[PDB]
Amino acid sequence: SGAIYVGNYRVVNRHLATHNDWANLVWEDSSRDLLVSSTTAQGCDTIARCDCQTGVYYCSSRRKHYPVSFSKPSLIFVEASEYYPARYQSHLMLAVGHSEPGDCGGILRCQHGVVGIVSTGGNGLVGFADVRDLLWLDE
Numbered sequence: 001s002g003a004i005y006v007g008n009y010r011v012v013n014r015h016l017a018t019h020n021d022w023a024n025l026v027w028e029d030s031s032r033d034l035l036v037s038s039t040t041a042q043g044c045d046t047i048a049r050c051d052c053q054t055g056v057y058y059c060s061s062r063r064k065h066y067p068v069s070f071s072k073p074s075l076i077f078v079e080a081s082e083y084y085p086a087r088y089q090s091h092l093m094l095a096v097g098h099s100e101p102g103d104c105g106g107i108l109r110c111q112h113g114v115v116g117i118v119s120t121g122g123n124g125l126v127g128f129a130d131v132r133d134l135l136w137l138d139e
């Protein structure tokens, strides 16, 4: 679990969005596993606007942060789960690092701000949904 709170927006994994997120929907994209909802309170986070390929992510299944080198956002095949059929997920970045079911929502940050959230993983890989291209989150 986990979310990004920026301005009057809450960014979550689309597959973990609540009834309240869907009732206050701003934007969602199944191909990216993202959903953004509106908030009444002002958010605590700031978004990176950069091309960093290294950073640090929070891994809830270890209660720890780990440094990672990750690929540029791209279209990656993701196997079927209870949440989605087998499909290509877009704007996904992969890295070597621990992740297991329940780690989705952990933030990846570089020195410039929030880069994205955990969205996939397994067998010593961790995948992050990029948010750096969503320029409207800042306005």
Ligand SMILES: NC(=O)[C@H]1CCCN(C(=O)Cc2ncncc2Cl)C1
Pocket: 015, 033, 078, 081, 083, 084, 089, 099, 100, 101, 102, 103, 104, 119, 120, 121, 122, 123
């Ligand atoms: N973005 C998706 O399609 C994910 C929806 C939830 C399921 N999913 C996963 O990868 C779960 C997973 N399994 C093993 N290690 C880590 C993780 Cl996060 C795929």
Ligand SMILES: [Zn+2]
Pocket: 048, 049, 050, 051, 052, 110, 111, 112, 113
């Ligand atoms: Zn950066």
